[PDB]
Design a protein around this ligand. Structure first.
Ligand SMILES: [Cl-]
Length: 159
């Protein structure tokens, strides 16, 4: 009932996970999606694998999407089928926490949880400033370092 329109490969994979847990556990889930991470093939595929392996355990996005563009906030307990660029399911993640912080207040520990490149805050900054500047242009605003982010932490539950 909750994900009839999901792309078939990812729907099948998600059904495998739900069937591999007890009815009590599967029936609690109410929020589902299927997507890749990032905006390019190289990083989508690297990130799916980092997530698979437990190296990438967090992500973030501009809060502007939710407060101004009306996107639904991420929820604890959400399941995402993590695909590669080409839509092949790689793993399933469950959101474990959601919070907010300014871009310029992102910590070294959060950058390390995101797990990309050398895990440093400098690498995290270079990557995110670029990506968020592009999104901001399409949104019709300029990126500022004081903008709020939505931080998500998550865990692998299936692969
Ligand atoms: Cl903050």
């Amino acid at each position: 009932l909750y994900f009839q329109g999901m792309e078939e490969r990812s729907q099948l994979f998600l059904e495998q996970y739900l069937s591999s847990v007890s009815r009590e556990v599967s029936e609690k889930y109410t929020s589902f999606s299927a997507d890749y991470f990032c905006a390019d093939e190289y990083n989508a595929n690297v990130c799916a694998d980092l997530i698979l392996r437990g190296e990438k355990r967090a992500s973030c996005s501009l809060e502007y999407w939710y407060s101004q563009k009306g996107e639904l906030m991420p929820q604890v307990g959400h399941l995402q089928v993590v695909t590669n660029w080409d839509g092949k399911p790689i793993c399933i993640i469950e959101i474990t926490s959601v919070s907010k912080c300014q871009y310029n207040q992102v910590s070294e520990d959060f950058a390390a949880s995101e797990g990309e490149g050398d895990k440093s805050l400098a690498w995290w900054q270079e990557a995110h400033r670029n990506f968020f500047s592009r999104e901001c242009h399409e949104l019709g605003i300029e990126f500022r370092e004081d903008m709020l982010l939505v931080l998500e932490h998550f865990k692998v539950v299936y692969h």
